[PDB]
Every structure is written in C-alpha cells, then in structure tokens.
C-alpha cells in the first residue's frame, strides 16, 4: 500500500495549497508546526541547519497530521537527492535551477530506470517501510513531486523551457534571491522585482505548471494568491517566533 | 573569578524583571528567546522534555545574551539539584513547596559544608569552569539564588513561614496547579483564584522576599506587576508559537 | 478534541489485545515495530536504555500508525510518571507494584488534583498539543490507562487488594520477575510458577480487571490467551533481532 | 602499532567471508548485530540514515568483536572518503563505480602523497588513535582496502579495465541496480539477469580480484559462494527485523 | 560466554591498579582515554554531566581497550542501579555510603533474588548480549563488583561495619567530601585529614578489602599506592585537559 | 548591530593572534578550551568527526568567551560555505587552494550579489539572529573573513597570484599536507619544507595579506611568530590531550 501523495494531487485541483517554512530543524519543534493548520510543511535543507537524520526525524514527527511535508535540499545533487527519497520524501524542491537540461537531470535522479537513473535500495529504507510496500519499484515513480527553484537571472531567462520540461510539476520563485540578482537585494517589494515576479507566475501557468512563492508579508501572500499560484508559503517559523518574542518583551520594557 | 548573579542582585533593587517560559527543550530553539530581550529565561525540567544535557546544551547557548538562565527541576531531590549546579545554574525554581521544614531542607542543599550538604566536586564541572574559578568552594553560596514555587493550598497556608526561611530569596506563585487544588481546574481567572494569588502576592512582599507569577495573560501579568511581583513571567515560548502558527494558517483557510 | 485511549476501549470489550516489547530505544528502529501489526507496542523504560527524550522520539515514530503505546517507567515515581504524562503517553505500566497502597498513589499519580496529585503544565506540553485540545484539563483524567506489575511475593500476598483498587484498570504479571522472587530463577516455566501465574490470572479477572503477561515462548503465550489475558506481548524486538541474526550466520558458518 | 585489516587479508586467503547488512544506523541496534558471530559488516552511507557521526559510533560499538566493519560511503566522493578514513574506516565498498578512471581515482583517494592525494591530518584523527599508532603515516596504505561496485551497463562494459586496476581488491555486484539496468526492474531471478552475474563473477576471478555480492535469497548466496565468491552478505538487519516481526503478529491475529 | 570482571580479578590480585576520572561525558573524548593506558577508567555519574545513554556510549568505545570501566552513579538508588548493571556496567562506586546497613543494601540491589532485589529483565539487555550468554541469570552475581564511597564523618565512624559487609568488595575515600566533613574544606593536606585517610585505609585492608582514592597530586598518590590501596585515580581528564590547554596559551601570551 | 568580526580587525592590526586546534567535535569538550586564554579556535570540518550541527553547538558553546571561532569547511564547496555562512561563521579557513581563480570563487562563495554568488535565507538564519540584525544583507560581506589553505606543489607555484586576489585577507600554510606533497611526508622539519614556508610567509607578507600557519612544536610555533605569521596555531585539543594522558599513565606503569 504505496502512500499517496496528497501535495502532488491538489497542485492539480483548482484550490491553493497554504504552507508554512520550518527552519527550527529539530522533530520536537517541527510536531508544534503540524498542529498549526497548514496544507504543506517546508523542511529546509538549505538555509536551516538540518542534515538527513534530522529530516528523518521531522518526517516522523509531521506524518499522523495532514499537512504534506516538502524537502528543499541544499542543492540538487543526485547522490543527496536519492538519501532523501529513502528516507520517505515524496516533494523535493530543489534550489538554483537554471537551465531546461539541469532541471531534465533532476527528473532521472528521481525515478528508477529505464525512466531515471535513481539508484535501487528501497528495501532497506522508509520509503518502501523497510519493503512492507508492495511493487514500490513499479509504482514509486508516479508518487514523486519535483518542484524546482527559479532565482536567478539566467534561471528567469530560460523560464519557459524549465517550466516545459517534463516532470517539473511546479516552478518556485524565490523572491529574496531574485530581488538580490536583479539589484535590490533586501527589497522584494520593489515595482520592479514585483514585475517580474508577476510576468514569471504568468509563464509557469502558461506552461501548464503549478507557480509557488514564500512570503513572510502576507499582503503580498495574499496578491500571489490572487494571480493564480498553485502553492504559497505564508510565513517562517523562526521569523515568527523571534519577532513574537521580542514584541512580548518589548511590551514590558 | 566566580560568576556573578545577576537575576539574585536585581531582585534586591526595585526593579522588576520580566520573563520567558522556556519549553522548546532544544538548545537552537532556546538561542532565539535568548536574542528577545528578557531579564531572565527559565528552562523547564518539570513539565518541559529536556534532562541534564538538554539543559546544559540550552546554558551554553544563553550564556553570550543578557538574559539570565533560571532552571526549574522536576522535583526538590538533592541528587538532581547536586547535578544542575554542577552544570554551572545558579538559580533554581524548586516546585511543590509545601512547608518551611522543605524549603530549609532545599537550602542546604544548595550550600557548600558547615552551612549545608552539597558535595565537594565542583572542579571538574563547568560550575567551577573546571576549577579556573579562585576560591569557588568559599564564595559559591553567595552566588545561589533559591526560589521556591508554592503551586497547592497547604504551601499557602504555610506561605509565611516558608518565605521567612533564611535563604529562600523568592516565593514563586504556580497559578494554573494552585487553580486545581483549589477546584477551579482550568480556572485560574475565578475570582476566588484572583484573590489567593493577590493576598499570596501580599504576603511574600510583607517578609521581605520576592513574589514571582507566571502569567500568558497580559492583563493578569500587568496587575501582577502593579501589585509589585519582583520576577514576572509574560508568556511561553510554545504557546506563542502554537499560537502564532495557528492564527496564520486561519488568515488563509 | 482530546485523543481516545483505543487500548483502554479494548481491554474493557471481549478481544485480546497482541503486544510487541520495545527495547532497540531508537525512534528509527521503532518505527519499523510499529509497521509489524501489533495491537500496542510496550516502550521499556525499565530495563532498556531509554531516558525522557528517547522515549519521546518513539511516541512519535509511532504515532501514524495502528498499534497503541504502553510506557514502562524503571519504577512507579511520582515525578517521572508526571514526566511521561506530559510527553503525550496515556497507558503506563508500573513495575514492582507491591500493595494496594501504592497502587492508590499511583492513581493519584496520573490523576490532577483535586482528586490527585499529578502536576499540572499541559500548555507547555505534547499531551495537550500545546493547548490545542479544548478544555484538556477537564477531561484527561478520563483517558489515563493504569496498568500495574506484580512480580514478587508481597505483590502476589495482596494480589487480590491490588486489583481492587478503583482506577486499575488491569494487573500485569512478571514471569522473570516473579519466577526468581519464588527460588526458581530463570526457570519460569517451573510449576510452582506456573501455578501461580495461573492463579493470579484467575483472581484478576474475576476483579473485573483485565490480566496481562509477556511470554517470549508461543505456546505459553497462547495458553495464556487461552486462560483469558486481555493484553499478553508476544516477543522482545531485541530477542527477535539477536536470534535471527546469529541463526543467520550459523547457517553459514 | 598500526590496526590490521583482518577482512582484506582473509580475501587473500582461500577463505570466504559471511556478511550482514547493517541499516538501522545505530550504534546500539549495530552492536546487537556484532553478536551474531558474521565475518564482515557492512554500514550502508548510501541507502540507510546514516552520516559521519553515525558511522562512527557504529565502528565503536563495532569494534570489541571479530566481525569486520565496512563502510559503503553515498558516493566515492573524495572529501567524504577522507572524512571515513580519518574516522578509522580500513574497507570502503564505493557504489556506482561505472570507469577504471574513476576506479583509479579512488585507488589515489585511500592513499597518501606521493602515491595518493589522502590529506595528511592524521594526528587529529582516531585512524591513527590520535597519534598513538607510530609510523602510522608510513603504513597505513597498506591496511587499506578498497572494493567498488558495478551496479550498470557502463559498469559491466568496463568490468574487465575496472578489475585490471592494481588497488581495487575486490569488485561488488549489485542485483538490484544491474537488474534494473538491464531492463528487469525488480526482477533479478531472470535469466539474462543470473548469467550477467555469473559471467561477471567469473571474470572477476580471472582478473585475480575478490567478486562480492549481496543475496538475502540463502539458497542463491549458497551459490555464488559456490561460484567462488570471496566477500557475499546474505542478510540486511532492516529486512530481518521486519520479516520476523511481521511474522509474528500473523501468528497471533 | 560471560563477560569476566577483569577488575574484579586485578583487585583480587596482589597489584594495585592505576585509573584516571572520566568528566567529559562523550564518547569520542573517552575513546582517547582508553588509549592513555590505564588499568581503570571512572565513568563518572555524579558530577559530570552523564546520564544513561551516554553511559552506554561511553562502555561501547571502551570496551576494545585494556582499561576497565568503572561507573559512579549520581546516588546508590535502586532504579539507577539496575538501569546501569542492565546496560553491562559491573563494577560500580556508589557515594554517600554511610552505614553497614546501607552498604548491605547496595549489595542485594547488584544481586538477582532470592538473595537480592535486581529487578529481572536481562533478556532486554546489553548486560546478558540481549540473550547470547547462556546461564546469565545464575551467574551475573558472580561478576558484580561494588564499590563504597566513605566521604563524611558518619561513614567514618561505621566504616569498620561498612568494610565488614559481604559483598562490599572495595571502599572508596573521598578526600574532597571528607575533608570538608572534617571541618577543612579546600583543604584536604591538612594533617587531621590525612591521618584519617590513612588510618581509614589501614582499617579497610585489615577487613580483607580493597581500599581506593582519588589524588591528582601525584607524590600523594604514590603514598596511597605505597600504603596498601587496591585501585588509585591518579588524574582527571578534565583537569588534564583545562590545564595543558591554559599553559599553552600562557607560554605564548 | 551586525557582530564585528575580531579576528578579522586584528589579522589588520601589528599583533599576532595565537589560535589552537578544536578536533574534539563536542560543544562540551569545545567549551574548556574557550576558557583556555586563547586568541582564536579552530573548528575543524576536514579532519575532526564535525558536521554542521556539531559545529553548531561548538559556536554557541564558544560565543561567551574572548576566543574568535574558525572554521575549516571538508572542501571548498560553495553549498557547503554557504550553510556555514548561515549558522554565524565569520571566519573560514578553506582547505586546498590552489589558484587565483579558486580563490576568486571563493571570495564569491561569501559575498551576497552582485558582488558574490551567496544564497539568500538569512531571515531563516543565525547569521542576522534570525532577521534581529538590522539590514543584514547590506553589511554582510564587511564583516566575513575569508583564509586559504596553500598545501601542496601547484598552490606554492600559485602563491603570489592567491595572495593577491582581493578578499583573500589570509594564506594559511599547512605544513603536513605541503610536506608529502615535497616528498617529505611526516617530516615537516625537513630543510626543504622549512625553506619552502619561510618562503612563503614571506611572499604572503609583501602582497599585504596575514600568513598562518600550524605548529604543535613550540619552538618552531616561535620561529613562525618570529618570521612574521599573523594568525598561528600553537596546538591540537586532542594531541594535548591524549599527550597528557598517556604521560601521566607512563608515570604509574
């Protein structure tokens, strides 16, 4: 009984997704966050200081609630791609992806041959509970959600051939590395940033994709949504947390 | 160079000090309430899961911000005491107080021979900083800060006596256990809760002592203030969090 | 909306309840048990290496799944049972449980006051999903399993008081235990024990209480089904592991 | 008095080696497994939760028994397979081994200038006991012991130039990923399958290297110890737990 | 095949054995002190920040080493004590003995019933290899070693009782403890003290039992050594450590 | 208020700054050594069993002293700096540089766009204290400090053109490494060696940048301070250590 991944099949439904970034990096902290409310959950690979055990641990504590984890690795590379498949992710998304041909490679690396080059070891890993999953090898592949992140200029540029490839479901926009590359780093909110973070939401849709977003301002949240994005982050933890904190003290002091 | 109490000597001035609820039991989560701007943070051993190296790990991540670390144990036991000043606390919050006959029994324990029963193995703990600290045995007690949590309606009753033991520097009020003793579980806003907690307020201030609360009611904490507590809680770090999250992911579904 | 004890609903329907004993003290290694199909799963904080924090780590991992988590505590102290009720367990089993007096503290122990003595701290803690369950407090004591080991002569003297006492909810027996208390130590099978064993089952359950057991051996595991045990485990994660692996290599060697 | 390499020797020896799979990266869970009496033991980096912290806890636990550990690394990465050697890792099985250059280059990778381009920071490091082994600099290339998996059709074109490499003691065959390969996911019983293998094992032999190989299939592990194979592995710890577990509660529901 | 207490047999014999104390709770630092060459190295509970699963960890890395582990529990509990022979320690120094019917206490809570109260759960445990020791139960006492701490004026005035104790195989002096006892704290040189310790010693060896201590100043040690003690601590790694570390910089600054 | 990195202010000063060697890869062991005295502190990635969330702890752990951290990532790997740069690292000493374009790659790795390549997440990260620091991104790279490790034959060639590349503040000389690369491996004192640093201390020192250096003998430690070394490492924590421990067991064996 392959489980099912419900991120994957809403991204094709009419509704948004709303989703939460978890930069805590600890499986206590994240089962708070599961609680909250969220469609999908964010563990980020990337810019929080999580490693694959740790991963694994979120990946524990977030299963018996109803919001669907996402995995941003560090980067997308095949070796560190194909530990997070085993250990039971189902949506990556992968940061600077620049090109149609890289986000092509990102495709094989999950899925196992003849259609990818992703390397078989399920029976010893929680992706296929430890081969509890029967015919995992024959079915993994069509639970799989590949998201990739545009964020840079040579990524906007090639944007209707990276949306085009087959097998990106969706197209993520960074707007804090986008902002910077374009020369207003720190200024997401700049008409120029938000043109084009309008024009790119357009392309994606065009192509057919699911486009994606993190706001931690939720006006601005609340604008993507309306232009038609399929999934949205509206806030970080950590942010959320330090700014309740020093707003409480704050007040006393 | 012995470490000096800086939550001991403020509580002695007239200011009061406000506070955070420390219950992420991690020592990341912890280094961001320490980056708020609270005069003092307490790590809970009681109702919180963290043990000795959870605790250790979240005092070397405080240490660097002004904010000064109170450690609440589990219990009064001497062993468990013993082992969180070794760990290098210098404040402790010891629950279920009941009687003056306890709370001299919890001095002693934190006191070196003649004047107590602590054991002599200081040097080889981070109390001591592995005995690079001069004359820690003959100067440690006057760096200890006692403070004892009457949380149940025999410690009311024997309030008095219990703040006028030498060496309890401060009476802390548990509000949501006294609550329940009381029969108004869940109730601490009841108007017979209110006029315990007040009288008890009262009562530390009258021996001399300092009267602390723990309060997520920011109305509540105020009057606690106005009635003049000298260490004052104003929330929890996983409520807020818990409550943050909640609120956002509603602004959206 | 408060979590259902399913295991306290079982014990009191017709159906006897297959266990597995968890002693690998890891959340990873857990969570394959509880993929096996087991009605509860035993974690050991008696006799294996498990502290607060591990313990914690395996509610987690096994929480997704069916099988339901009994929590030994190493003994039946007020303190770590306050601990364990935080950290989300609702069936404990209580080791070396001697007379009727100490089974009515620890009912008092998983009880909050008024009517007992378990502290009070649920909005800091998992059981209370950090206060996401509406009015946790009134209605927890509901949900409490109590379940207590007899595994020595006095224990057996007072077995039928013990299983009187009001809020036991079932009687466990400790062959290991019980069969060295009666001079036939690593010898449970011996009739003397036997007899016993099958006397105790007898007088628990015309109590009214369910009776509970652990035999390693399948066909003592059966004639205790068969003597009518509501809840018997069946196997030890570290016998099963130990035996198939040196039985593996024996093969070969 | 540098470490000996009990499994490299044994390779040069006419005897056989019997391994197990180890995935439940755990040092506790991994110690259970070094009592199961097997020659070798493999801690599998590239498919089980494992890092470099993990890995090492294992080789401690690992090492008071006979059973010799060897490390599967995610990729023959050479800042990851210096991090093993300095960890104290004598035998590395590297996977998706597909060229005798790459061959070559892992060969440089295990050793140290001039021969090899292994960065000298031994002192530091427990694969000289920190300094305790004299002349380890000077010997340690010796206990070294390098095996390399072919695992697809690249790999198996080139199996006769990556054999032919002087350092690689041994060559691994991967069923799962040259199966799927070859156009049979999921399906190694087949025969076109069966005699890739066997043909490979052979000229394994005749390049005079070890031919390795994985089987929890007993009957066919009995066999290709029979064709000569001098390092096979015929059980995965993961696998064996669930398989029994599982086994068990279907005895009892 | 029953791990021998290697320990127990040195201290049977007529050479004394030479120890070092273990504060840095890791079990990568223990490693390196196994490799320093000491016939005993001291786990030590009380006042470092030590808990079960470190222990554990700490066992593991030493158990390759000629050194034999000796574990100081925080207090000679009975739970505490059970937890700690479960996970293979044998040899223990309980502090704070202060009386013949303490000590007699200690040494039923190390022997399995009838003659003890060791609560039975081998089959779980690291201590029987989870089962592989055949006859674990009948022989386990056969291999306890227990250690008595005298540190205070009470356990001097019993310590020809305490010593006379069957199973009580060694006494320990605490000069700290004691010597803050005395009315000298920080100053245990004081001739007062060291005449009890060396009539304390006299006594203990008169009994037919091993007399211990713990001295960092090594003309001192090599005076217990000369008058009769069985097992001398000769250094702290902590203190080992602190010191090389701020005399380096020192030369340098 | 960005924090100010020290250690970058005084490489500009006329005054050296004496560092020592961190390979313990604890936050516990790491914090004795902060209490050492010394200048800076070396957290080693490449050769100490350290990974990102050790270092973590490590940085917490060292924060409260007056030793500036250093970090030594495995590789010069722009994904693996970048999470480095997140958690608060100021300071990396990067391993293997061996030419201009290299280094200008690694100028780029820690500087935000348009002036470098650096991801953007820093309202997720400790480097702004999570979004607490004030216009963060717009002061970043003012306080990074960037030093190169020239180790072996093609880096030396390179020397003048590392040296010189803008935002190369220091050159580092590993002598171990440069040593082998000579064909004097394990022979650092070696003429030929020797010639070739003071070589390059001299060449590093005329392009205006810090030169560095590691030495655990002390008179050579002197003649490298002498020559004009900026930054010099005068130890390793766990030679000191396992140096102790071994001397001291000598004494008594």
């Known amino acids: 009984d392959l489980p099912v991944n419900r991120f994957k099949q809403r991204l094709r439904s009419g509704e948004a997704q709303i989703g939460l970034w978890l930069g805590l990096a600890d499986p206590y902290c994240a089962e708070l966050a599961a609680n909250a409310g969220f469609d999908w959950l964010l563990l980020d690979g990337e810019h929080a200081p999580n490693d694959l055990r740790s991963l694994l641990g979120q990946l524990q ?3 018996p609630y109803p919001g669907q984890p996402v995995i941003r690795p560090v980067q997308g590379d095949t070796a560190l791609i194909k530990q997070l498949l085993d250990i039971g992710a189902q949506t990556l998304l992968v940061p600077m992806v620049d090109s149609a041909a890289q986000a092509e490679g990102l495709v094989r690396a999950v899925r196992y041959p003849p ?3 992703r390397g078989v070891g399920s029976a010893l890993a929680r992706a296929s509970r430890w081969n509890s999953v029967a015919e ?3 079915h993994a592949d069509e639970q799989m959600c590949l998201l990739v992140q545009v964020e840079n200029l040579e990524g906007l540029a090639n944007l209707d051939a990276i949306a085009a490839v087959e097998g990106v479901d969706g197209v993520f926009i960074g ?6 590359a374009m020369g207003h780093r720190g200024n997401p909110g700049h008409p120029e940033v938000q043109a084009a973070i309008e024009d ?3 392309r994606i849709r065009t192509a057919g994709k699911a486009a994606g977003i993190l706001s931690a301002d939720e006006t601005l949240a609340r604008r993507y949504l309306e232009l038609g ?3 949205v982050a509206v806030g ?3 942010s959320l947390l330090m700014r309740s904190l020093r707003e409480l003290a ?3 002091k």
Chains 1, 2, 3, 4, 5, 6 share one sequence.
Request: charged share 10%; with cysteine; net charge negative.
């Open 229 to 231: 994005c399929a999934f």
């Open 236 to 238: 970080v933890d950590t």
């Open 136 to 138: 995992y090898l024959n």
């Open 175 to 180: 707007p804090a590395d986008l902002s910077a």
């Open 250 to 252: 704050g007040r006393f």
């Open 61 to 63: 504590a977030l299963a």
């Open 115 to 117: 259609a990818g080059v």
């Open 200 to 202: 790119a939401i357009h």
